[PDB]
Enzyme design. Structure first.
Site, PDB file in Angstrom:
ATOM      1  N   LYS A  64       0.853  -1.183   0.000  1.00  0.00           N
ATOM      2  CA  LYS A  64       0.000   0.000   0.000  1.00  0.00           C
ATOM      3  C   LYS A  64       0.874   1.212   0.000  1.00  0.00           C
ATOM      4  O   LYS A  64       0.562   2.212  -0.639  1.00  0.00           O
ATOM      5  CB  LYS A  64      -0.933  -0.028   1.198  1.00  0.00           C
ATOM      6  CG  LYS A  64      -1.979  -1.101   1.038  1.00  0.00           C
ATOM      7  CD  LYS A  64      -2.824  -1.236   2.302  1.00  0.00           C
ATOM      8  CE  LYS A  64      -4.093  -1.977   1.976  1.00  0.00           C
ATOM      9  NZ  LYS A  64      -3.841  -3.427   1.841  1.00  0.00           N
ATOM     10  N   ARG A 175       1.554  13.574  31.014  1.00  0.00           N
ATOM     11  CA  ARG A 175       2.586  13.418  29.994  1.00  0.00           C
ATOM     12  C   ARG A 175       3.110  14.769  29.404  1.00  0.00           C
ATOM     13  O   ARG A 175       4.000  14.734  28.562  1.00  0.00           O
ATOM     14  CB  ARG A 175       2.054  12.529  28.834  1.00  0.00           C
ATOM     15  CG  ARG A 175       1.705  11.104  29.228  1.00  0.00           C
ATOM     16  CD  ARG A 175       1.773  10.130  28.058  1.00  0.00           C
ATOM     17  NE  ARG A 175       1.026  10.545  26.866  1.00  0.00           N
ATOM     18  CZ  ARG A 175      -0.279  10.475  26.711  1.00  0.00           C
ATOM     19  NH1 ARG A 175      -1.050  10.015  27.692  1.00  0.00           N
ATOM     20  NH2 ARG A 175      -0.799  10.859  25.559  1.00  0.00           N
ATOM     21  N   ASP A 182      -9.530  14.712  27.429  1.00  0.00           N
ATOM     22  CA  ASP A 182     -10.372  14.607  28.592  1.00  0.00           C
ATOM     23  C   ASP A 182      -9.497  14.842  29.813  1.00  0.00           C
ATOM     24  O   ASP A 182      -8.279  15.120  29.693  1.00  0.00           O
ATOM     25  CB  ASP A 182     -11.064  13.242  28.672  1.00  0.00           C
ATOM     26  CG  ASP A 182     -10.101  12.079  28.952  1.00  0.00           C
ATOM     27  OD1 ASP A 182      -8.925  12.315  29.230  1.00  0.00           O
ATOM     28  OD2 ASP A 182     -10.571  10.923  28.922  1.00  0.00           O
ATOM     29  N   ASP A 184      -8.310  12.808  33.255  1.00  0.00           N
ATOM     30  CA  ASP A 184      -8.254  11.523  33.920  1.00  0.00           C
ATOM     31  C   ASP A 184      -7.755  11.760  35.348  1.00  0.00           C
ATOM     32  O   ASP A 184      -6.695  12.353  35.529  1.00  0.00           O
ATOM     33  CB  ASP A 184      -7.279  10.628  33.167  1.00  0.00           C
ATOM     34  CG  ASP A 184      -7.665  10.466  31.678  1.00  0.00           C
ATOM     35  OD1 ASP A 184      -8.725   9.853  31.389  1.00  0.00           O
ATOM     36  OD2 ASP A 184      -6.872  10.914  30.816  1.00  0.00           O
ATOM     37  N   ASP A 243     -12.789  11.223  33.459  1.00  0.00           N
ATOM     38  CA  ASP A 243     -12.733   9.839  34.008  1.00  0.00           C
ATOM     39  C   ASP A 243     -12.127   9.892  35.399  1.00  0.00           C
ATOM     40  O   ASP A 243     -11.043  10.438  35.542  1.00  0.00           O
ATOM     41  CB  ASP A 243     -11.835   8.955  33.191  1.00  0.00           C
ATOM     42  CG  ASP A 243     -12.334   8.754  31.737  1.00  0.00           C
ATOM     43  OD1 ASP A 243     -13.566   8.867  31.485  1.00  0.00           O
ATOM     44  OD2 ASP A 243     -11.477   8.458  30.863  1.00  0.00           O
TER      45      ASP A 243
HETATM   46  N1  1RZ Z   1      -6.744   1.703  24.607  1.00  0.00           N
HETATM   47  C1  1RZ Z   1      -6.368   2.282  25.765  1.00  0.00           C
HETATM   48  C2  1RZ Z   1      -6.932   3.467  26.114  1.00  0.00           C
HETATM   49  C3  1RZ Z   1      -6.592   4.063  27.305  1.00  0.00           C
HETATM   50  N2  1RZ Z   1      -5.760   3.427  28.146  1.00  0.00           N
HETATM   51  C4  1RZ Z   1      -5.400   4.022  29.399  1.00  0.00           C
HETATM   52  C5  1RZ Z   1      -6.673   4.370  30.195  1.00  0.00           C
HETATM   53  S1  1RZ Z   1      -6.167   5.709  31.214  1.00  0.00           S
HETATM   54  C6  1RZ Z   1      -4.890   6.212  30.106  1.00  0.00           C
HETATM   55  C7  1RZ Z   1      -5.300   7.497  29.416  1.00  0.00           C
HETATM   56  O1  1RZ Z   1      -6.400   7.194  28.556  1.00  0.00           O
HETATM   57  P1  1RZ Z   1      -7.155   8.347  27.751  1.00  0.00           P
HETATM   58  O2  1RZ Z   1      -8.033   7.517  26.812  1.00  0.00           O
HETATM   59  O3  1RZ Z   1      -7.776   9.487  28.551  1.00  0.00           O
HETATM   60  O4  1RZ Z   1      -5.999   8.966  26.811  1.00  0.00           O
HETATM   61  P2  1RZ Z   1      -4.927  10.171  26.973  1.00  0.00           P
HETATM   62  O5  1RZ Z   1      -5.098  10.804  28.337  1.00  0.00           O
HETATM   63  O6  1RZ Z   1      -3.665   9.439  26.578  1.00  0.00           O
HETATM   64  O7  1RZ Z   1      -5.346  11.055  25.744  1.00  0.00           O
HETATM   65  P3  1RZ Z   1      -6.447  12.226  25.741  1.00  0.00           P
HETATM   66  O8  1RZ Z   1      -7.409  11.896  26.815  1.00  0.00           O
HETATM   67  O9  1RZ Z   1      -6.959  12.051  24.355  1.00  0.00           O
HETATM   68  O10 1RZ Z   1      -5.675  13.478  25.929  1.00  0.00           O
HETATM   69  O11 1RZ Z   1      -4.610   5.194  29.138  1.00  0.00           O
HETATM   70  C8  1RZ Z   1      -5.229   2.210  27.790  1.00  0.00           C
HETATM   71  O12 1RZ Z   1      -4.388   1.637  28.591  1.00  0.00           O
HETATM   72  N3  1RZ Z   1      -5.527   1.632  26.615  1.00  0.00           N
HETATM   73 MN    MN Z   2      -7.128  11.374  28.861  1.00  0.00          MN
HETATM   74 MN    MN Z   3      -9.759   9.129  29.799  1.00  0.00          MN
END
Ligand code: 1RZ
Ligand code: MN
Ligand code: MN
Ligand code: CL
Ligand code: CL
Ligand code: MN
Ligand code: MN
Ligand code: MN
Ligand code: MN
Ligand code: NA
Ligand code: NA
Ligand code: NA
Ligand code: NA
Ligand code: NA
Length: 328
Positions: A64, A175, A182, A184, A243
């Site tokens: 691809k 980070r 969101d 957390d 969350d």
């Molecule tokens: N598929 C996933 C999704 C989340 N997680 C975990 C749950 S808690 C941590 C942060 O998740 P979030 O989905 O809020 O992502 P981030 O804080 O990295 O980004 P934004 O919220 O998009 O700023 O990663 C995981 O281990 N596997």
């Molecule tokens: Mn997040």
């Molecule tokens: Mn989250």
DNA sequence: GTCGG
DNA sequence: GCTGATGCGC
DNA sequence: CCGACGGCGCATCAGC
């Protein structure tokens, strides 16, 4: 500006198609791994056999990439883009609570647009109804300034409920990201350990009383998923996903490692843990049983101890985000 | 779709 | 009730 | 129909 951005965008779009239309979560994860290893590669990709040297890029993606380098497009994607059913299915899964299954069901029943969705509110469960309500708001990202303001409300209210709580904002915020999808909030309290309220409910309820939490998507004993909003300045801020997750106090380091992400980092770490003979979750790291029970949890006194066990060099939270490279 | 066994 | 999937989310 | 692929909370269902 993004090095290999054309390639990585193509792979992402294929990913989303396999997840939402094909319901093939491992093909989704495969395209994501490929987009990801390519995004982090510090050279412009010259050919498919070049990308193939990377772990996660194989025969088919190599082709691809040759097609894309050669023509500026991918016929497979042009056909998908032309499939109105596939386009509507993709679009509906942007609503929180609607996945590939619900999306296809709605589309098959002739719900194809956002207006159609609004007219059919009665088919939606609560989570979906709230996802719909705040669909536009949830598309916007949160500036770090506003994350700081949000953090101030959360910590102050949690401390009012009980001073033994410790709340730590994790995810993209921890980070060092300049904006987040969101908020957390990782929560601990000495009354909740792996061995041992209302601990979460008291916190949520206090945030609702001060009109910071506006709606609930889902809520259990250990995890809240909902909606919040900063107090307006004159006369309004967008509604935001929050969350909150209570984790056992004696298992903080596995917890914060998890809650810090990124998604891809966490998964990659867990995959590397399996290869080395361990299993990692948000509570523990454990040796794999010869049988197929994990054995006793290993002691962990820092984030770094987890990395040490699986022979990975330590990464600071800022180096656990995905990155890209640039061209001139 | 890729990889390892 | 519990267990184990199914869907969807972090 | 190579089989595994990260792992689990909350909501819900199927089977017992
Ligand atoms: N598929 C996933 C999704 C989340 N997680 C975990 C749950 S808690 C941590 C942060 O998740 P979030 O989905 O809020 O992502 P981030 O804080 O990295 O980004 P934004 O919220 O998009 O700023 O990663 C995981 O281990 N596997
Ligand atoms: Mn997040
Ligand atoms: Mn989250
Ligand atoms: Cl799959
Ligand atoms: Cl565990
Ligand atoms: Mn950039
Ligand atoms: Mn790189
Ligand atoms: Mn219809
Ligand atoms: Mn590895
Ligand atoms: Na490869
Ligand atoms: Na179709
Ligand atoms: Na969704
Ligand atoms: Na209706
Ligand atoms: Na709003």
């Amino acid at each position: 500006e993004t090095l290999n951005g054309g390639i990585t965008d193509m792979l992402t779009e294929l990913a989303n198609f396999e997840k939402n239309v094909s319901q093939a979560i491992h093909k989704y994860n495969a395209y994501r791994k490929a987009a990801s290893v390519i995004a982090k590669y510090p050279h412009k990709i010259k050919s498919g056999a070049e990308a193939k040297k990377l772990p996660g890029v194989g025969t088919k993606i190599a082709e691809k990439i040759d097609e894309f380098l050669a023509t500026g497009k991918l016929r497979k994607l042009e056909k998908i883009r032309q499939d109105d059913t596939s386009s509507s299915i993709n679009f509906l899964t942007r609503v929180s609570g609607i996945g590939p299954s619900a999306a296809r069901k709605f589309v098959d029943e002739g719900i194809k647009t956002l207006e159609d969705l609004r007219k059919n509110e009665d088919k939606l469960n609560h989570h979906q109804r709230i996802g719909l309500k705040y669909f536009g708001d949830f598309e916007k990202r949160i500036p770090r300034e506003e994350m700081l303001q949000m953090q101030d409300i959360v910590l102050n209210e949690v401390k009012k409920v009980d001073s033994e709580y410790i709340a730590t904002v994790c995810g993209s915020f921890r980070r060092g990201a300049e904006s987040s999808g969101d908020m957390d909030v990782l929560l601990t309290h000495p009354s909740f350990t792996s061995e041992s309220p209302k601990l979460l409910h008291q916190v949520v309820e206090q945030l609702q009383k001060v009109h910071f939490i506006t709606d609930t998507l889902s809520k259990g004993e250990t995890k809240f998923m909902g909606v919040c909003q900063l107090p307006s300045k004159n006369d309004e801020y967008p509604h935001r996903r929050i969350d909150i997750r209570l984790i056992p106090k004696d298992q903080y380091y596995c917890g914060v490692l998890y809650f810090t992400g990124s998604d891809i980092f966490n998964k990659n770490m867990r995959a590397h843990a399996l290869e080395k003979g361990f299993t990692i979750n948000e509570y523990t790291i454990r040796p794999l049983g010869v049988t197929g029970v994990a054995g006793e949890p290993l002691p962990v006194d820092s984030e770094k101890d987890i990395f040490d066990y699986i022979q990975w060099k330590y990464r600071e939270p800022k180096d656990r985000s995905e990155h890209h490279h640039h061209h001139h």
